[PDB]
C-alpha cells in the first residue's frame, strides 16, 4: 500500500550518494525537514545536527557572498537555481558544492528540494589539466632548443664520418711508408680516432635521452643509470672543480624502472646542484644508494651549494615555484610525479654543510 | 485525515518528486517476481538512457547491455545478487539511440520489513574516463618534452662538450702534417691531401656546433632600439666571413624607419641566425649577394628583409601556397627558424618566407615601431 511504498523510496534515497535536502519555507527561516544519508556522508554532520537548520550553516569564510545572493533571490521568486559554491564539512574541510535547487508544488504547498554534489575532485582534475597544458606552453622555447640541439648533433655525424674515412684511408697509405716519422703519424691518427669515437658517444647519449621511445618499466642497474645521467648532466663539473663521489652499494643496485625517466630525474638534480654551487667555496656532490623499507631502494643526492632558506622547503616541488630569475620551476614537480608513478617518494632536506639533499625511492627488483 | 506534510500520501508525493530531481540513475527491482524486473525508475535514469519510463518498468536491467559489454563483469553482478551482496562494476551499456556510455553501477539489497528489494544507482562516467585518458596523455607528453627542455637549458655546455674532441682532432691532424713534411715516400701527398680534407671537415663540424649557442640567454625586456645599430652588431658577429666567401653585402637601411620596440639581445639573435643561414646557403653557389632592407609596414610595424642568392630553403622550410606562413622541418636550421619566429611573435610581429628570382631565400619579419605613423608618410 501507499505506506510501504513510502518506505521503499526513502530507503532508496539513502543509497543515492548525492546529498538531498528538502526545506519547508512555511516554517521560520526555511529549515531542512528531510535529509538523506548522502548529505550526511558528504558533510560529516549527523542527521540531528542538520534537521531543523537552514542550509546556510554549511557556509564559511571563502563562500562567495554574491552567489549566496543569487540563491536568496531565486528562492524569493520561487525560481530554480544552480550554483557552484564553497561549503565546509563538520571537520572544517572545504568542499566545492554544486548546488541545484528547485521549487516543488505538492497539494498547493511549496517546498524546495536541494541536490548537492561534492565536485572538489572534479575541480582538482580540471585544474590539473589546465596546469599540464600550461607547463607544456611554459617549456616550449627550451624544448625547441633541445630539439635543435638534437638535430644539430645528428648533423654532426656526417663530417665525423668523413673524418673517419679520411683517417682510415690515410692509415691504409701509411702502411706502405717506411719513413721514420710514420709510427708517430699513426699514433696521432689513432688518438684522433679515439676523439671521434668519444664525440660520437656524446651525440648518441643526447639523442637516446630525447627520443620519445618505449616507456616500459624494467630491471635496471642504478650504477649504470647514475653514470648515464652523469655523462649528460655533470658536464662542466670537473672544470668547475666539483668533487664527484658515487658511493654505491652493489647489493642494492637493481630497481624496477623506466631508465630514461630515472635518468631525467637525476639529470635535473645534477644541473640544479651545479647551479647551486656556482658561488660556493667547497663544491662536493655525493650520490648514494641504500636499502629502504618495503623492498625499496633509496637514492640520495647531496651538494654543498647555497641550499634552502627556511621558508623554501615546503614549496620546492610546487609547479612553477622557482627562486631563479630565469627559472621555470617545473623540474622538481615533474621529477616527483615520475617517482610517484614508479611507486616511490621524493623529498628534500637541508644538510649539515648548508647545502641541499634530495632523496627518492624506487622498488627493488631481483 | 492529515494536512500536507503531516500525511502519508503528501509525504510519498514529496519524496517521489525529490527522487525525480536526483540526476543520477535510480532503479528498484523486485526479485520475488520472475527475472527480477524493474518496478521503479527515476527521471535521472530516463535522461541518462534515452528510454521513457514505460520502456523501462517491467524489464530486467540487462536490456542496457549489448555488443562490448564485458561478460566477466556481468557474471560478477549475477553472482553478487544470488548471494544478496552489494556490488560495484564499471560496465558498458547502450542508450536508446545506440550510443555507448560507461555506467558505474552501485547495487545494494534493501530490506523493507521482510521483503528483499534491490536498489541500483547508475552514473554515466564516460566523460570522466575521457578526462582521465587526456590527463595521462598530457602527463606523458610533459615527461618527454621535459627531457628536450633539460637539453635546451644545457645548449651551451653541450657545445663546450662537443668542441673539445673536435679541437683535439684538428690539432692531431695539424701535428701529423708537420710530421709528414719532407717525407720522400710517394704516398705522402695523398696522405697530406686526405689530412687536409679531414681538417676542413673538422672546421665544418665546429661551425655546426657553434649553432647550439644561437639562442642562449638573461631576462628579456623590450626597449626602444635602433634597427640599424642592431643590424650592424649582428653583422659583425654573423657576417664575419662574408669577405672570405666573396659574398657581396648590400644594405639599404632606412633612417627614419629605424626605431623599434625590441629586446636587443633576442633581435640580434634572430638576425645573426638569418645571416649565418644565408652564408651556409650560398656556399657552393654562383651569384653571392645578401640584401638587407627595413621598411615601414601596416599596423604601426617595421618590416625587415633578409634575402640571399643561395640554393633555397626547401630542406628546412615548407612555405604555404600564399607564402604567408612556413612550416619548419626537423633540421638544425628548421628548428632554429621556428625559435626565431617564436621570438618575433613574442614581440608582436610575424615572420615569413618567400622564394626569390635567384632561386634563393627571402626572410621577412616585423617589429612594432616606436613611432605610430610611417607608411602613411611614404
Ligand atoms: C533546498 C535548499 C538547499 C540548499 N542547500 C544549500 C547548500 O547545500 N549549501 C549552501 O551554502 N546553501 C544552501 N542553501 C541556501 C541557504 O539555505 C540560503 O538560502 C542561502 O544562504 C541564501 O539565503 P541567506 O542570504 O539568508 O543566507 C539551500 C537552500 C535551499 C532552499
Ligand atoms: C537494481 C539493479 C540495477 C541494475 N542495473 C544495471 C544496469 O544499469 N546495467 C546493466 O548492464 N545491468 C544492470 N543490472 C544487472 C542486470 O539486471 C543483470 O543482473 C546482469 O546482467 C546479470 O544477470 P544475467 O547474467 O542473468 O544477465 C542491474 C541489476 C539490479 C538488481
Ligand atoms: N640543489 C639545490 N640546491 C638549492 N636549491 C635548489 C636545488 N634544487 C632545486 N632548488 C630550489 O628549488 C627550486 C625549484 O627547482 P626546479 O623545480 O628544478 O625548477 P627551477 O630550477 O627552474 O627553479 C629552485 O628554483 C631552487 O630554489
CSV table of N, CA and C in Angstrom, one decimal, chain B residues 194-328:
chain,number,residue,atom,x,y,z
B,194,UNK,N,94.4,14.0,-47.9
B,194,UNK,CA,93.4,13.4,-47.0
B,194,UNK,C,93.3,14.1,-45.7
B,195,UNK,N,94.5,14.4,-45.1
B,195,UNK,CA,94.5,15.0,-43.8
B,195,UNK,C,93.9,16.4,-43.9
B,196,UNK,N,94.1,17.1,-45.0
B,196,UNK,CA,93.6,18.4,-45.2
B,196,UNK,C,92.1,18.4,-45.4
B,197,UNK,N,91.6,17.4,-46.2
B,197,UNK,CA,90.1,17.3,-46.4
B,197,UNK,C,89.5,17.1,-45.0
B,198,UNK,N,90.2,16.3,-44.2
B,198,UNK,CA,89.7,16.0,-42.8
B,198,UNK,C,89.7,17.2,-41.9
B,199,UNK,N,90.8,18.1,-42.1
B,199,UNK,CA,90.8,19.3,-41.4
B,199,UNK,C,89.7,20.2,-41.7
B,200,UNK,N,89.3,20.3,-43.0
B,200,UNK,CA,88.1,21.0,-43.4
B,200,UNK,C,86.9,20.5,-42.8
B,201,UNK,N,86.7,19.2,-42.7
B,201,UNK,CA,85.5,18.6,-42.1
B,201,UNK,C,85.5,18.9,-40.6
B,202,UNK,N,86.6,18.9,-40.0
B,202,UNK,CA,86.7,19.3,-38.6
B,202,UNK,C,86.2,20.7,-38.4
B,203,UNK,N,86.5,21.6,-39.3
B,203,UNK,CA,86.1,23.0,-39.2
B,203,UNK,C,84.6,23.1,-39.4
B,204,UNK,N,84.1,22.4,-40.4
B,204,UNK,CA,82.7,22.3,-40.7
B,204,UNK,C,81.9,21.8,-39.4
B,205,UNK,N,82.5,20.8,-38.8
B,205,UNK,CA,81.9,20.3,-37.5
B,205,UNK,C,81.8,21.4,-36.4
B,206,UNK,N,82.9,22.2,-36.3
B,206,UNK,CA,82.9,23.3,-35.4
B,206,UNK,C,81.8,24.4,-35.7
B,207,UNK,N,81.6,24.7,-37.0
B,207,UNK,CA,80.6,25.6,-37.4
B,207,UNK,C,79.2,25.1,-37.0
B,208,UNK,N,79.0,23.8,-37.1
B,208,UNK,CA,77.7,23.2,-36.8
B,208,UNK,C,77.5,23.3,-35.3
B,209,UNK,N,78.5,22.9,-34.5
B,209,UNK,CA,78.5,23.0,-33.1
B,209,UNK,C,78.2,24.4,-32.6
B,210,UNK,N,78.8,25.4,-33.2
B,210,UNK,CA,78.6,26.8,-32.8
B,210,UNK,C,77.1,27.2,-32.8
B,211,UNK,N,76.4,26.6,-33.7
B,211,UNK,CA,75.0,27.0,-33.8
B,211,UNK,C,74.1,26.6,-32.6
B,212,UNK,N,74.6,25.7,-31.8
B,212,UNK,CA,74.0,25.4,-30.5
B,212,UNK,C,73.8,26.6,-29.6
B,213,UNK,N,74.6,27.7,-29.8
B,213,UNK,CA,74.6,28.8,-28.9
B,213,UNK,C,73.7,30.0,-29.6
B,214,UNK,N,73.1,29.7,-30.7
B,214,UNK,CA,72.3,30.7,-31.4
B,214,UNK,C,71.3,31.5,-30.5
B,215,UNK,N,70.7,30.8,-29.6
B,215,UNK,CA,69.6,31.4,-28.8
B,215,UNK,C,69.8,31.3,-27.3
B,216,UNK,N,71.1,31.2,-26.9
B,216,UNK,CA,71.4,31.1,-25.5
B,216,UNK,C,71.3,32.5,-24.8
B,217,UNK,N,70.5,32.5,-23.7
B,217,UNK,CA,70.2,33.8,-23.0
B,217,UNK,C,71.4,34.4,-22.3
B,218,UNK,N,69.9,35.2,-19.1
B,218,UNK,CA,69.4,36.6,-19.0
B,218,UNK,C,67.9,36.8,-19.2
B,219,UNK,N,67.4,37.7,-18.4
B,219,UNK,CA,66.0,38.0,-18.5
B,219,UNK,C,65.8,39.0,-19.7
B,220,UNK,N,64.7,38.8,-20.5
B,220,UNK,CA,64.4,39.7,-21.6
B,220,UNK,C,63.5,40.9,-21.2
B,221,UNK,N,63.9,42.1,-21.7
B,221,UNK,CA,63.0,43.2,-21.6
B,221,UNK,C,63.0,44.2,-22.9
B,222,UNK,N,61.9,44.6,-23.3
B,222,UNK,CA,61.8,45.4,-24.5
B,222,UNK,C,62.1,46.8,-24.3
B,223,UNK,N,62.8,47.5,-25.2
B,223,UNK,CA,63.1,48.9,-25.1
B,223,UNK,C,63.0,49.5,-26.5
B,224,UNK,N,63.1,50.8,-26.6
B,224,UNK,CA,63.3,51.5,-27.9
B,224,UNK,C,64.7,51.2,-28.4
B,225,UNK,N,64.9,50.7,-29.6
B,225,UNK,CA,66.2,50.3,-30.1
B,225,UNK,C,66.3,50.8,-31.6
B,226,UNK,N,67.5,51.0,-32.0
B,226,UNK,CA,67.8,51.3,-33.4
B,226,UNK,C,68.0,50.0,-34.2
B,227,UNK,N,67.2,49.9,-35.3
B,227,UNK,CA,67.3,48.7,-36.2
B,227,UNK,C,68.7,48.7,-36.8
B,228,UNK,N,69.2,49.9,-37.2
B,228,UNK,CA,70.5,50.0,-37.9
B,228,UNK,C,71.6,49.6,-37.0
B,229,UNK,N,71.5,49.9,-35.7
B,229,UNK,CA,72.5,49.5,-34.7
B,229,UNK,C,72.4,48.0,-34.5
B,230,UNK,N,71.2,47.5,-34.4
B,230,UNK,CA,71.0,46.0,-34.2
B,230,UNK,C,71.6,45.3,-35.4
B,231,UNK,N,71.3,45.7,-36.6
B,231,UNK,CA,71.8,45.1,-37.8
B,231,UNK,C,73.3,45.1,-37.9
B,232,UNK,N,73.9,46.3,-37.6
B,232,UNK,CA,75.4,46.5,-37.5
B,232,UNK,C,76.0,45.5,-36.6
B,233,UNK,N,75.5,45.4,-35.3
B,233,UNK,CA,76.1,44.5,-34.4
B,233,UNK,C,76.0,43.0,-34.8
B,234,UNK,N,74.8,42.6,-35.3
B,234,UNK,CA,74.6,41.3,-35.8
B,234,UNK,C,75.4,41.0,-37.0
B,235,UNK,N,75.7,42.0,-37.8
B,235,UNK,CA,76.6,41.9,-39.0
B,235,UNK,C,78.0,41.5,-38.5
B,236,UNK,N,78.5,42.2,-37.5
B,236,UNK,CA,79.9,41.9,-37.0
B,236,UNK,C,80.0,40.5,-36.5
B,237,UNK,N,79.0,40.0,-35.9
B,237,UNK,CA,79.1,38.6,-35.4
B,237,UNK,C,78.8,37.6,-36.5
B,238,UNK,N,77.7,37.8,-37.2
B,238,UNK,CA,77.2,36.7,-38.2
B,238,UNK,C,77.7,36.8,-39.6
B,239,UNK,N,78.2,37.9,-40.0
B,239,UNK,CA,78.7,38.1,-41.4
B,239,UNK,C,80.3,38.2,-41.4
B,240,UNK,N,80.9,37.9,-40.3
B,240,UNK,CA,82.4,37.8,-40.3
B,240,UNK,C,82.7,36.6,-41.1
B,241,UNK,N,83.3,36.7,-42.3
B,241,UNK,CA,83.5,35.6,-43.2
B,241,UNK,C,82.9,35.8,-44.6
B,242,UNK,N,82.0,36.8,-44.7
B,242,UNK,CA,81.5,37.1,-46.0
B,242,UNK,C,82.5,37.6,-47.0
B,243,UNK,N,83.6,38.3,-46.5
B,243,UNK,CA,84.6,38.7,-47.4
B,243,UNK,C,85.3,37.5,-48.0
B,244,UNK,N,85.8,36.6,-47.1
B,244,UNK,CA,86.5,35.4,-47.5
B,244,UNK,C,85.7,34.5,-48.4
B,245,UNK,N,84.3,34.5,-48.2
B,245,UNK,CA,83.5,33.7,-49.0
B,245,UNK,C,83.1,34.5,-50.3
B,246,UNK,N,83.6,35.7,-50.4
B,246,UNK,CA,83.2,36.6,-51.5
B,246,UNK,C,81.7,36.8,-51.7
B,247,UNK,N,81.0,37.0,-50.6
B,247,UNK,CA,79.6,37.4,-50.5
B,247,UNK,C,79.5,38.9,-50.5
B,248,UNK,N,78.8,39.4,-51.5
B,248,UNK,CA,78.6,40.9,-51.6
B,248,UNK,C,77.4,41.3,-50.6
B,249,UNK,N,77.7,42.3,-49.8
B,249,UNK,CA,76.7,42.8,-48.9
B,249,UNK,C,76.1,44.1,-49.3
B,250,UNK,N,74.8,44.1,-49.5
B,250,UNK,CA,74.1,45.3,-50.0
B,250,UNK,C,73.0,45.7,-49.0
B,251,UNK,N,73.3,46.7,-48.2
B,251,UNK,CA,72.4,47.1,-47.1
B,251,UNK,C,71.7,48.4,-47.4
B,252,UNK,N,70.4,48.3,-47.6
B,252,UNK,CA,69.6,49.5,-47.9
B,252,UNK,C,68.7,49.9,-46.7
B,253,UNK,N,69.3,50.4,-45.7
B,253,UNK,CA,68.6,50.8,-44.5
B,253,UNK,C,68.0,52.2,-44.5
B,254,UNK,N,66.8,52.3,-43.9
B,254,UNK,CA,66.0,53.5,-44.0
B,254,UNK,C,66.2,54.2,-42.6
B,255,UNK,N,67.0,55.3,-42.5
B,255,UNK,CA,66.9,56.1,-41.3
B,255,UNK,C,65.5,56.7,-41.3
B,256,UNK,N,64.9,56.8,-40.1
B,256,UNK,CA,63.5,57.3,-40.1
B,256,UNK,C,62.5,56.2,-40.4
B,257,UNK,N,63.0,54.9,-40.3
B,257,UNK,CA,62.1,53.8,-40.3
B,257,UNK,C,62.9,52.8,-39.4
B,258,UNK,N,63.6,53.4,-38.5
B,258,UNK,CA,64.7,52.8,-37.8
B,258,UNK,C,64.4,52.4,-36.3
B,259,UNK,N,63.5,53.1,-35.6
B,259,UNK,CA,63.3,52.8,-34.2
B,259,UNK,C,62.2,51.8,-34.0
B,260,UNK,N,62.5,50.7,-33.2
B,260,UNK,CA,61.5,49.7,-32.9
B,260,UNK,C,61.5,49.4,-31.4
B,261,UNK,N,60.4,48.8,-31.0
B,261,UNK,CA,60.3,48.3,-29.6
B,261,UNK,C,60.8,46.8,-29.5
B,262,UNK,N,61.9,46.6,-28.9
B,262,UNK,CA,62.6,45.3,-29.0
B,262,UNK,C,63.5,44.9,-27.9
B,263,UNK,N,63.6,43.6,-27.7
B,263,UNK,CA,64.7,43.1,-26.8
B,263,UNK,C,66.0,43.0,-27.7
B,264,UNK,N,66.9,43.8,-27.5
B,264,UNK,CA,68.2,44.0,-28.2
B,264,UNK,C,68.9,42.6,-28.5
B,265,UNK,N,69.0,41.8,-27.4
B,265,UNK,CA,69.7,40.6,-27.5
B,265,UNK,C,68.9,39.5,-28.4
B,266,UNK,N,67.6,39.4,-28.1
B,266,UNK,CA,66.9,38.4,-28.9
B,266,UNK,C,66.8,38.8,-30.4
B,267,UNK,N,66.7,40.1,-30.7
B,267,UNK,CA,66.6,40.5,-32.1
B,267,UNK,C,67.9,40.3,-32.8
B,268,UNK,N,69.0,40.7,-32.1
B,268,UNK,CA,70.3,40.3,-32.6
B,268,UNK,C,70.5,38.8,-32.9
B,269,UNK,N,69.9,38.0,-32.0
B,269,UNK,CA,69.9,36.5,-32.2
B,269,UNK,C,69.2,36.1,-33.5
B,270,UNK,N,68.0,36.7,-33.7
B,270,UNK,CA,67.3,36.4,-34.9
B,270,UNK,C,68.1,36.8,-36.2
B,271,UNK,N,68.7,38.0,-36.2
B,271,UNK,CA,69.5,38.5,-37.3
B,271,UNK,C,70.7,37.6,-37.5
B,272,UNK,N,71.4,37.3,-36.5
B,272,UNK,CA,72.7,36.5,-36.6
B,272,UNK,C,72.3,35.1,-37.2
B,273,UNK,N,71.2,34.5,-36.7
B,273,UNK,CA,70.7,33.3,-37.3
B,273,UNK,C,70.4,33.4,-38.8
B,274,UNK,N,69.7,34.4,-39.2
B,274,UNK,CA,69.4,34.6,-40.6
B,274,UNK,C,70.7,34.8,-41.4
B,275,UNK,N,71.6,35.6,-40.9
B,275,UNK,CA,72.9,35.9,-41.6
B,275,UNK,C,73.7,34.6,-41.7
B,276,UNK,N,73.8,33.8,-40.7
B,276,UNK,CA,74.6,32.6,-40.8
B,276,UNK,C,73.9,31.6,-41.8
B,277,UNK,N,72.6,31.5,-41.7
B,277,UNK,CA,71.9,30.6,-42.6
B,277,UNK,C,72.1,31.0,-44.1
B,278,UNK,N,72.2,32.3,-44.3
B,278,UNK,CA,72.4,32.8,-45.6
B,278,UNK,C,73.8,32.5,-46.1
B,279,UNK,N,74.8,32.7,-45.3
B,279,UNK,CA,76.1,32.3,-45.7
B,279,UNK,C,76.2,30.8,-46.1
B,280,UNK,N,75.7,29.9,-45.2
B,280,UNK,CA,75.7,28.5,-45.5
B,280,UNK,C,75.0,28.2,-46.8
B,281,UNK,N,73.9,28.9,-47.0
B,281,UNK,CA,73.0,28.6,-48.2
B,281,UNK,C,73.7,29.1,-49.5
B,282,UNK,N,74.7,29.9,-49.4
B,282,UNK,CA,75.4,30.5,-50.5
B,282,UNK,C,76.8,29.9,-50.8
B,283,UNK,N,77.2,29.0,-49.9
B,283,UNK,CA,78.4,28.2,-50.2
B,283,UNK,C,78.0,27.4,-51.4
B,284,UNK,N,79.0,27.0,-52.2
B,284,UNK,CA,78.8,26.2,-53.4
B,284,UNK,C,77.8,26.9,-54.3
B,285,UNK,N,77.7,28.2,-54.2
B,285,UNK,CA,76.7,29.0,-55.1
B,285,UNK,C,77.4,29.9,-56.0
B,286,UNK,N,76.6,30.3,-57.1
B,286,UNK,CA,77.1,31.1,-58.2
B,286,UNK,C,77.2,32.6,-57.9
B,287,UNK,N,76.1,33.3,-58.0
B,287,UNK,CA,75.9,34.7,-57.6
B,287,UNK,C,75.9,34.6,-56.0
B,288,UNK,N,76.7,35.5,-55.4
B,288,UNK,CA,76.6,35.5,-53.9
B,288,UNK,C,76.3,36.9,-53.5
B,289,UNK,N,75.0,37.2,-53.2
B,289,UNK,CA,74.6,38.5,-52.8
B,289,UNK,C,73.6,38.5,-51.7
B,290,UNK,N,73.8,39.3,-50.7
B,290,UNK,CA,73.0,39.4,-49.5
B,290,UNK,C,72.4,40.8,-49.4
B,291,UNK,N,71.0,40.9,-49.4
B,291,UNK,CA,70.3,42.1,-49.3
B,291,UNK,C,69.6,42.2,-48.0
B,292,UNK,N,69.8,43.3,-47.3
B,292,UNK,CA,69.1,43.6,-46.0
B,292,UNK,C,68.4,45.0,-46.2
B,293,UNK,N,67.1,45.0,-46.0
B,293,UNK,CA,66.4,46.3,-46.0
B,293,UNK,C,65.4,46.4,-44.9
B,294,UNK,N,65.0,47.6,-44.5
B,294,UNK,CA,64.0,47.8,-43.5
B,294,UNK,C,63.0,48.8,-44.1
B,295,UNK,N,61.7,48.7,-43.7
B,295,UNK,CA,60.7,49.4,-44.4
B,295,UNK,C,59.4,49.5,-43.6
B,296,UNK,N,58.8,50.7,-43.6
B,296,UNK,CA,57.5,50.8,-42.8
B,296,UNK,C,56.4,49.8,-43.3
B,297,UNK,N,55.7,49.3,-42.3
B,297,UNK,CA,54.6,48.3,-42.7
B,297,UNK,C,53.3,48.7,-41.9
B,298,UNK,N,52.2,48.0,-42.3
B,298,UNK,CA,50.9,48.3,-41.8
B,298,UNK,C,50.8,47.9,-40.3
B,299,UNK,N,49.8,48.6,-39.6
B,299,UNK,CA,49.6,48.4,-38.2
B,299,UNK,C,50.7,48.8,-37.3
B,300,UNK,N,51.4,49.9,-37.7
B,300,UNK,CA,52.5,50.5,-37.0
B,300,UNK,C,53.7,49.7,-36.8
B,301,UNK,N,54.1,48.9,-37.9
B,301,UNK,CA,55.2,48.0,-37.8
B,301,UNK,C,56.3,48.4,-38.7
B,302,UNK,N,57.5,47.9,-38.4
B,302,UNK,CA,58.6,48.0,-39.3
B,302,UNK,C,59.0,46.6,-39.8
B,303,UNK,N,59.2,46.4,-41.1
B,303,UNK,CA,59.4,45.1,-41.7
B,303,UNK,C,60.9,45.1,-42.2
B,304,UNK,N,61.5,44.0,-41.8
B,304,UNK,CA,62.9,43.8,-42.2
B,304,UNK,C,63.0,42.6,-43.2
B,305,UNK,N,63.8,42.8,-44.3
B,305,UNK,CA,64.0,41.8,-45.3
B,305,UNK,C,65.5,41.3,-45.3
B,306,UNK,N,65.7,40.0,-45.3
B,306,UNK,CA,67.0,39.4,-45.5
B,306,UNK,C,66.9,38.4,-46.6
B,307,UNK,N,67.5,38.8,-47.8
B,307,UNK,CA,67.5,38.0,-49.0
B,307,UNK,C,68.9,37.5,-49.4
B,308,UNK,N,69.0,36.3,-49.8
B,308,UNK,CA,70.2,35.7,-50.3
B,308,UNK,C,70.0,35.1,-51.7
B,309,UNK,N,71.1,34.8,-52.3
B,309,UNK,CA,71.1,34.2,-53.7
B,309,UNK,C,71.6,32.7,-53.5
B,310,UNK,N,71.2,32.1,-52.4
B,310,UNK,CA,71.7,30.7,-52.1
B,310,UNK,C,70.8,29.6,-52.8
B,311,UNK,N,71.0,28.4,-52.4
B,311,UNK,CA,70.3,27.2,-53.0
B,311,UNK,C,68.9,27.0,-52.5
B,312,UNK,N,68.4,27.8,-51.6
B,312,UNK,CA,67.0,27.8,-51.2
B,312,UNK,C,66.8,27.1,-49.9
B,313,UNK,N,65.5,27.2,-49.4
B,313,UNK,CA,65.2,26.8,-48.0
B,313,UNK,C,64.5,25.5,-47.9
B,314,UNK,N,64.3,24.8,-49.1
B,314,UNK,CA,63.4,23.6,-49.2
B,314,UNK,C,63.8,22.5,-48.3
B,315,UNK,N,65.1,22.4,-47.8
B,315,UNK,CA,65.5,21.4,-46.9
B,315,UNK,C,65.1,21.7,-45.4
B,316,UNK,N,64.7,22.9,-45.2
B,316,UNK,CA,64.5,23.4,-43.8
B,316,UNK,C,63.1,24.0,-43.6
B,317,UNK,N,62.5,24.4,-44.7
B,317,UNK,CA,61.2,25.1,-44.6
B,317,UNK,C,60.2,24.7,-45.6
B,318,UNK,N,58.9,24.6,-45.3
B,318,UNK,CA,57.9,24.4,-46.2
B,318,UNK,C,56.9,25.6,-46.2
B,319,UNK,N,57.0,26.5,-47.2
B,319,UNK,CA,56.1,27.6,-47.3
B,319,UNK,C,54.7,27.2,-47.8
B,320,UNK,N,53.7,27.9,-47.4
B,320,UNK,CA,52.3,27.6,-47.9
B,320,UNK,C,52.2,28.3,-49.3
B,321,UNK,N,51.2,27.9,-50.0
B,321,UNK,CA,50.9,28.4,-51.3
B,321,UNK,C,51.0,29.9,-51.4
B,322,UNK,N,50.5,30.6,-50.4
B,322,UNK,CA,50.5,32.1,-50.5
B,322,UNK,C,51.8,32.7,-49.9
B,323,UNK,N,52.7,31.9,-49.4
B,323,UNK,CA,53.9,32.4,-48.9
B,323,UNK,C,53.7,33.4,-47.8
B,324,UNK,N,52.7,33.1,-46.9
B,324,UNK,CA,52.4,34.0,-45.8
B,324,UNK,C,52.7,33.2,-44.5
B,325,UNK,N,53.1,32.0,-44.7
B,325,UNK,CA,53.4,31.1,-43.5
B,325,UNK,C,54.4,30.1,-43.9
B,326,UNK,N,55.2,29.6,-42.9
B,326,UNK,CA,56.0,28.4,-43.2
B,326,UNK,C,56.0,27.3,-42.2
B,327,UNK,N,56.2,26.1,-42.6
B,327,UNK,CA,56.3,25.0,-41.7
B,327,UNK,C,57.8,24.6,-41.7
B,328,UNK,N,58.3,24.5,-40.5
B,328,UNK,CA,59.7,24.1,-40.3
B,328,UNK,C,59.9,22.6,-40.3
